[PDB]
Amino acid sequence: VSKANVPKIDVSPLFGDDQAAKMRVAQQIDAASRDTGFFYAVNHGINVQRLCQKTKEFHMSITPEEKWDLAIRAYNKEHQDQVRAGYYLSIPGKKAVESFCYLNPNFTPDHPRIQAKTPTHEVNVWPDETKHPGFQDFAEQYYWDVFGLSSALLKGYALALGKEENFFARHFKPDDTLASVVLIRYPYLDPYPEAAIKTAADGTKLSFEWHEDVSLITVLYQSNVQNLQVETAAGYQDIEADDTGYLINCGSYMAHLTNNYYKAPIHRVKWVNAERQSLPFFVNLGYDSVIDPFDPREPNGKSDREPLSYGDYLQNGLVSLINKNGQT
């Protein structure tokens, strides 16, 4: 298997005021987005070792009782308001992965979209503070840390596309972003049940099949265990692990807005019998956010795509991904 070209890009100028240095970062984002569609953001300022420490403490502390009490409606019919946020249980013998998803901490009971019961907005559920001391506070702060990195990355993508640096970020706001964090646990199992292993057409053993992301961009931390592959013209290629950087790729909303100039790369998760963490942040805009599609390969920049509101995109995309690749 070929090693995929996944450059390491120092994104630290995107936090500062050196506009020429920011354009040199934007060029690197442009190049990576036009090639394999993946890069590692380095010098990103986030303490990922502590993220891993706190997530591990959670995954290793949580009990079967708590998992039912936090479970999304796919696992617990009592929790009809929990579509996105909460616990996604494993099924021993059948489904190995388990995870905990949370949304914008500003989606509180008094938030206008929660009052309205607008789809894709939910109030987060949390375990009991006494059983998981500090976890909720850590997780909410992590949301804002990775929100900050993502805002910076979005300035880079905007400049890369010939736009002003606020072009995406003006739609990515603390009060209404639909962005989510998922704390995924992939277990070591001995024996590992075959029913929890999928097989690709090319014979590769998988934990999660080929897909494009439902996101504007995806901002991912993972353990130092190689598992991801990206489809290129030369076939599926291995993405090297780097548990110091964030792996960045575009989702299909970016592909829509740019008329596939920045494609949403097809990728999949190899089966690995290893205890590891996968911690994506899906960079989603607000429910009513709508960016007019354009084409940076066309002189007048015009596109034959129709505008699509982010809330429409997200609600439909998350259902479709479950139907295609299964309930996580």
Ligand SMILES: CC(C)[C@@H](NC(=O)[C@H](CS)NC(=O)CCC[C@H](N)C(=O)O)C(=O)O
């Ligand atoms: C590839 C990783 C990001 C990870 N896969 C994933 O997280 C997969 C594919 S991107 N993502 C999903 O299923 C969408 C979860 C959306 C989330 N519940 C939300 O409501 O916002 C894995 O390690 O399996």
Ligand SMILES: CC(O)(O)C(F)(F)F
């Ligand atoms: C969580 C971690 O394994 O990355 C370390 F090194 F911080 F302990």
Ligand SMILES: [Fe+3]
């Ligand atoms: Fe993905």
